[PDB]
Design a protein around this ligand. Structure first.
Ligand SMILES: CC1CN([C@H]2C[C@H](O)[C@@H](COP(=O)(O)O)O2)C(=O)NC1=O
Ligand SMILES: CC1CN([C@H]2C[C@H](O)[C@@H](COP(=O)(O)O)O2)C(=O)NC1=O
Ligand SMILES: CC1CN([C@H]2C[C@H](O)[C@@H](COP(=O)(O)O)O2)C(=O)NC1=O
Ligand SMILES: CC1CN([C@H]2C[C@H](O)[C@@H](COP(=O)(O)O)O2)C(=O)NC1=O
Ligand SMILES: [Zn+2]
Ligand SMILES: [Zn+2]
Ligand SMILES: [Zn+2]
Ligand SMILES: [Zn+2]
Lengths: 164, 164, 161, 165
């Protein structure tokens, strides 16, 4: 596509997939510009929103955005870039720890040529595919950067049990 | 082992065909399927999913066609999947203005599986199409019809056909 | 991911033919011409040589039940080299879990390969990637449906052996 | 609940990346993974054929085989492992530089629960998906280990044009 979107819960390998795709384009001598979030820990810039990238991205064939849920203007950015002929690849969570959608990523679903939702493996039961991220630490902050020390991926029934 | 599977994409992408392909697979394994449309294999047409009542509980698989028309689809699918049903939904992710059907987006975040199909561009005939363009003048977001009122188009065709 | 040769495989009752048709319908809707070949536009033949050159007038060529045609790889390659979108639905494996060599060859020549699954008709609980023959017969080709075959998961296939 | 998953496609399609993506998923769920290359615990081994791995693989939940086309006995190995309840994941070329199949990988297709054929991007025209590997050095050895110094991935028409010479 022109906008390709990779979603799924944490630990599903979304970033790995993003990089797999970028690497394919790099082997064909296509120029890739990789955008990461400031906060999150193959890169080009780290920013807190996509406005701050300015116009540098126009010099490249492929634009990759990692952790798309953190950028509040991601839909507009991707559309602008794709209209300028760029292949835009975005990796992002579709859902927060409360199973509520990141509205901006949803909007991207509707504008995307390609949408792939990856799965993880349930870290609780170890037996099923996992489509949900459960927060293991008490915090009401929606944006809380961290890894397996603060989150685990779970299947539907594990998510319910743990919520109780 | 309930689950939610979601099939999205623009019109003429064969979403309904895919829904039926999946249902047929379960039917061959003697699993009971209940098919809901917007007005054992059981069939019913309703205007909202509340109106289906509890009949669906007697079945292994629940299929919902044209999910964008049901305003309570997310809740329904979650209830059914929590009761152990395999729930399969076919739906438009985007309206004719490229805006998301908010309820289907919510379903993306709750789904075990998400597949976004493409159509073929009906304007240029040369590219994959991820968008639906309305060919008749009307501002009603809900307007039931086929190729007499809509065509599927690629990204650039959608832009050019919008400007004229 | 589509292409010039697209291949759809999997066991019986996986909906391969349905998927083939889904893809054909997409093209038809974009006013592309489609020629549909079945085993003994539309035509039924016993091998693809017998179709002659009629296929050249069409944008898309669809072959259903590809495992039955002994020359399918060559046909698909000729057609795809002539600019056709070639879509083939076929069993990858026979009832003894042995490959249909001509397909497995196509795999290597295909732009796109999708292996569909069925639902296990024995345990009713798991995805099925194998076809088990339920009637006694040693003919590798034996045309029929759920009266002669069922699709099964790996462990059911073993146990039923 | 053993299974065989097969990842195929031409060179530079990210097959090995995908293999590792899948392994990493299992690792995060504390499943043990044993990774076999050609010559929660993750074990690694390099061998020239799969007989040489012996029985160590039985201690693990997931078995991953990279570069499957190099192992002449891969089908039998995967089937044995999957029958013992292992999740077996294989990354391999389906086709050689002459577009001929690796027969053993084809056999695996027929035994696999899952088959995914990845594509690369055409390194010649830069404009299309690539499903074929073209060898850029003169050699008749079917096995010739190397990277972009000896191979490029190409689309169908580029493969044809390049072959004409
Ligand atoms: C589930 C999460 C995750 N996160 C964070 C944790 C990680 O830093 C990041 C997920 O990275 P990933 O897309 O899995 O490579 O987002 C939230 O801020 N809110 C949530 O509700
Ligand atoms: C693009 C559309 C389509 N529709 C309607 C027309 C069709 O009856 C139906 C699409 O059927 P489908 O989901 O493609 O099997 O949705 C809308 O109401 N609003 C839109 O914006
Ligand atoms: C499993 C089979 C099935 N068949 C036949 C039975 C059906 O006529 C056909 C099924 O193809 P389909 O799955 O519909 O595309 O193939 C064989 O000839 N040999 C086998 O080993
Ligand atoms: C196309 C090839 C490639 N090769 C080699 C080059 C690499 O070492 C390896 C492929 O790596 P890959 O499966 O992409 O991780 O196989 C052959 O020996 N013969 C062929 O015909
Ligand atoms: Zn679980
Ligand atoms: Zn177009
Ligand atoms: Zn079974
Ligand atoms: Zn090319």
């Amino acid at each position: 596509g022109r906008i390709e979107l990779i979603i799924g819960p944490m630990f599903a390998g979304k970033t790995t997939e993003l990089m797999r795709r970028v690497q394919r384009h790099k082997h064909a001598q296509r120029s890739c510009y990789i955008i990461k979030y400031t906060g999150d820990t193959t890169a080009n810039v780290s920013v807190s929103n996509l406005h701050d990238v300015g116009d540098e991205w126009r010099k490249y064939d492929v634009i990759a955005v990692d952790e798309g849920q953190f950028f509040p203007d991601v839909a507009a950015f991707c559309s602008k870039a794709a209209d300028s002929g760029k292949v835009v690849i975005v990796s992002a969570l579709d859902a927060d720890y409360l199973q509520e959608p990141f509205e901006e990523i949803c909007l991207l679903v509707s504008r995307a040529d390609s949408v792939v939702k990856l799965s993880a493996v349930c870290m609780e039961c170890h037996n099923r595919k996992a489509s949900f991220t459960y927060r293991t630490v008490k915090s009401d902050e929606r944006k809380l950067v961290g890894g397996s020390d603060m989150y685990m991926s779970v299947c539907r029934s594990c998510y319910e049990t743990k919520r109780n």
